[PDB]
Ligand binder design. Structure first.
Ligand code: SF4
Ligand SMILES: [Zn+2]
Ligand SMILES: [Zn+2]
Lengths: 138, 754
């Protein structure tokens, strides 16, 4: 937060926190404009956010401004899952139990995705997304 | 005395009577025969409560239909006031009739001021007391107690002795005024709380505050036995919309937002810990979801129900499963996502106001959480916590604040309004945004009781105009009848002090600040009033921040030392224990020798329920007119609604409210027709709002008494106090205005049947 907002500018709340601390949809990290720009400009290099080695991508970042990254992961994961499972049957005929259960199943992957317990079911959730994406293509 | 309404023997508690009481008996009984509302402004100069209780007590025990009576005074000071008087009438009625009571009537306020469990009761805030008793007497904690005889679940043992003898029967016979109820229940070591709540199904008449009728969070236990064919009275019903808008509005601060994260993690901890030990229960409530909203153990809860329904009592709720939310990890991941979309609208840079839907859409824009699952948050959290059976709520306090908001904004539309103030302009440019959310139509809250109840009465000493209420509240009336004060004497002085000695118009509308002309002018008027009025004098600033600024620099000048030579000075502090310690010492000094001066805020707590008798009030004052656009645009928004939904302008609404509380303050110094005292008005605008005052006040405010300088005000009240100090008791002109005992009513009025 006020003590971790970048590899470079970790303390940025009182350093005019107007510059953008982007999460790469694959970084989930607080990267001040200096480092994140430095990175995607050269390209997908890691954001050195506190020993980090995860590739701060090229210009594919999203916006997450300090939204409790446990939520930012929980928010970024749910939308893609809710997009991968976009409308797998939820209003095909108007059912409320199955749709909500399918909904109760829908974000249960996201809750698992936001958790990633011992991951072997999150991988199973990914195969469902590929199955959901394969079903979407057809 | 026992006359007739041509059908109703009336055991009026006093052998004497008053004329306006009888016209009230006439028109209320005229209102009780035909289903109507008939707002009846009863000037507090007479005893409206005595006239109210004597006839309805007659009506219900004369007629066989209206078995239940309801009487909603604003505050709990007025609750016991009705309780003690009903007790006196009841005794007097027995004193003439014998034993024809078969009557139970109990007041109904709360746990904290009724909890006889000391440790529970020694606490201060409402929350811990009630919750102590809960963990102390919980249908789970008790289960934790009898199933596991152990030290962990205490019980009040008042709840238990409630449970033993009391929940078969009732308290012996009394109309237990709060003084009487507690003593008995403390003598019977009975929790008068768990007692009185369970004889709601048994009391003939019930006395409770507006919140329990209007605040839906506590208006859930509504039982049709007290409700169905019952007869309803609204006493002191001018502050109805404010209580309604109060009972439906909501706030948020980034700091409270921080608290929810802790609970959300603490839930993310609390959900995680129960599920490892016992998730087979947590699934058990998942199928208890898929069948329905789980009413078997979310509403049928003796001591369990955790999160109340901030929404109206269960009208606008659907019964299905909350979409995704069936899962608790959903719910916490869902709650993990909702607490963060507020923080970004929290930090919204300036004031922005949204409708519940556009915000709901804008929410749906950033995150597609449907309105329908969103609406289910309140009871969804309530149950889980009890399935969590959590030990503490403090980590979860900011959690239920959000459940109230999400249910509200996802349910209501087109009557409410969001607004995003990112600061308080009184300390602007600091981190303290607020997510203000409030209602605009006060008809909404009253519509169900107007939809539910048939025979209702609206009665106050102050209601003016009696038509603003049918407009705002959107309801039908029959006898909107008020009565004038027919007196054989003057008995009070309303004055318009527009000018000071400098002949200078005065106000608090200029600022909430100092302008040594007006301030010293105000200081001069106060110090001379402190010289002239007898023991008991009160004043009413438009705003406390007006009081604080003006008073502080009044001690700066020598104005405070002089009144300290004459009288006692007793301030109104926000903490009311000090205020109470002030007020009783004001009344004590009023009943004692050295004069007592009580200075309060027109919009403050003292004006709501506290009375000023002969000695406790002589000369009320009103420095300027109470106005609120000192503060931000929330009134503008509702006023805009007041302007768009109703044909009500800015000034007409503001002057109505300003004179609504102006009228509310002036009438307390008077108790009966034998009471007197000065009600001076001190502002230029009071010259033009003489009509906005209630009739009985307006009848007393004459043309020559307009825009008076402060100087001839003192001469007028000087002769007033002298002449009033005389014992002007003809006892035959009082045959006109007292209508001597049972005859001048039976002689003259039974001649008046023309
Ligand atoms: S009602 Fe009973 S359990 Fe509740 S606070 Fe009072 S004494 Fe304690
Ligand atoms: Zn940096
Ligand atoms: Zn990162």
């Amino acid at each position: 937060e006020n003590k971790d907002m970048c590899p470079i500018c970790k303390t940025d709340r009182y350093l005019s926190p107007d510059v953008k601390f982007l999460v790469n949809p694959e970084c989930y990290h607080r990267i001040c404009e200096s480092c994140v720009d430095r990175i995607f400009s050269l390209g997908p290099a890691q954001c050195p956010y506190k020993g980090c080695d995860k590739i701060l991508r090229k210009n594919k970042f999203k916006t997450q401004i300090f939204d409790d990254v446990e939520v930012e992961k929980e928010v970024d994961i749910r939308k893609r899952v809710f997009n991968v499972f976009n409308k797998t049957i939820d209003d095909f005929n108007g059912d409320l139990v199955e749709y909500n259960k399918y909904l109760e199943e829908v974000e249960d992957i996201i809750y698992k995705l936001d958790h990633g317990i011992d991951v072997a079911k999150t991988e199973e959730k990914l195969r469902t997304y590929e199955e959901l994406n394969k079903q979407l293509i057809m | 005395m026992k006359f007739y309404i041509d059908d109703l023997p009336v055991l009026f508690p006093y052998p004497k009577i008053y004329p306006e009481q009888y016209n009230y008996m006439c028109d209320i009984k005229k209102t009780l025969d035909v289903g109507g509302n008939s707002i009846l402004e009863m000037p507090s100069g007479t005893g409206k409560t005595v006239s109210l209780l004597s006839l309805t007590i007659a009506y219900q025990m004369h007629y066989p239909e209206h078995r239940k009576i309801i009487y909603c005074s604003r505050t709990m000071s007025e609750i016991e006031k009705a309780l003690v008087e009903l007790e006196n009438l009841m005794d007097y009625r027995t004193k003439e009739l014998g034993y024809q009571e078969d009557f139970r009537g109990l007041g109904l306020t709360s746990r904290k001021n009724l909890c006889l469990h000391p440790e529970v009761s020694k606490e201060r805030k409402g929350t811990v007391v009630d919750e102590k008793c809960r963990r102390m007497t919980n249908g789970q904690a008790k289960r934790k107690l009898e199933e596991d005889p152990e030290a962990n679940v205490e019980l009040c043992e008042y709840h238990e002795n409630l449970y033993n003898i009391e929940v078969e029967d009732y308290l012996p016979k009394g109309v237990f005024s709060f003084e009487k109820l507690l003593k008995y229940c403390e003598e019977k070591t009975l929790c008068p709380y768990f007692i009185v709540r369970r004889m709601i199904s048994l009391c003939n008449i019930i006395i409770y505050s507006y919140h329990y009728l209007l605040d839906p969070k506590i208006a859930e236990r509504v039982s049709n036995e007290v409700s169905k064919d019952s007869i309803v009275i609204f006493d002191e019903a001018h502050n109805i919309d404010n209580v309604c808008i109060e009972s439906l509005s909501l706030d948020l601060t980034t700091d409270a937002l921080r608290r929810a994260t802790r609970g959300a993690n603490a839930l993310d901890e609390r959900i995680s810990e129960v599920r490892k030990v016992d998730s087979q229960k947590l699934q058990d409530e998942y199928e208890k979801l898929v069948q329905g909203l789980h009413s078997a153990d979310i509403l049928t809860d003796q001591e369990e129900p955790f999160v109340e329904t901030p929404v109206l009592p269960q009208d606008l709720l659907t019964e299905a499963i909350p979409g995704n939310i069936r899962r608790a990890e959903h719910f916490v991941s869902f709650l993990k996502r909702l607490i963060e979309y507020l923080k970004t609208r929290m930090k919204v840079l300036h004031v922005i106001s949204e409708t519940p839907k556009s915000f709901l859409q804008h929410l749906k824009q950033l995150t597609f959480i449907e309105r329908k699952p969103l609406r289910f948050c309140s009871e969804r959290l309530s149950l889980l916590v009890r399935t969590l059976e959590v030990t503490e709520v403090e980590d979860f306090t900011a959690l239920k604040d959000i459940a109230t908001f999400a249910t509200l904004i996802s349910t209501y539309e087109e009557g409410f309004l969001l607004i995003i103030e990112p600061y308080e302009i009184e300390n602007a440019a600091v981190p303290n945004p607020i997510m203000r959310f409030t209602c605009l139509d006060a008809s909404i809250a009253i519509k169900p009781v107007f939809e539910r109840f048939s025979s209702v009465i609206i009665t106050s000493g102050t209601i003016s105009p009696l038509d603003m209420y049918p407009r705002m509240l959107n309801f039908k009336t029959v006898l909107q009848k008020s009565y004038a004060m027919t007196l054989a004497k003057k008995s009070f002085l309303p004055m318009i002090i527009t000018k000071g000695s400098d002949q200078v118009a005065i106000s608090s509308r200029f600022e909430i600040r100092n302008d040594p002309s007006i301030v010293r002018n105000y200081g001069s008027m106060l110090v001379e009033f402190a010289k002239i009025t007898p023991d008991g004098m009160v004043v009413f600033f438009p705003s406390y921040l007006y009081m604080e600024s003006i008073v502080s620099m009044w001690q700066t000048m020598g104005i405070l030392d002089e009144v300290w030579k004459h009288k006692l000075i007793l301030v109104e502090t926000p903490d009311a224990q000090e205020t109470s310690l002030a007020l009783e010492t004001y009344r004590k000094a009023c009943s004692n020798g050295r004069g007592a001066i009580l200075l309060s805020v027109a919009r403050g707590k003292v004006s709501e329920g506290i009375d000023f008798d002969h000695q406790y009030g002589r000369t009320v004052l009103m420095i300027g007119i109470p106005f609120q656009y000192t503060e931000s645009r929330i009134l503008k928004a509702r006023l805009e609604f007041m302007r768009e939904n109703y044909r009500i302008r800015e000034n007409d609404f503001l002057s109505f409210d300003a004179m609504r509380h102006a009228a509310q303050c002036l009438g307390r110094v008077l108790r009966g027709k034998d009471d007197y005292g000065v009600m001076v008005l001190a502002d230029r605008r009071f010259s033009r709002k003489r009509s906005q005052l209630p009739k009985w006040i307006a009848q007393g405010l004459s043309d020559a008494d307009l825009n008076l300088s402060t100087d001839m005000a003192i001469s007028n009240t000087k002769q007033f106090l002298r002449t009033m100090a005389q014992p002007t008791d003809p006892k035959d002109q009082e045959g006109v205005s007292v209508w001597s005992y049972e005859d001048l009513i039976k002689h003259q009025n039974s001649r008046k049947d023309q």
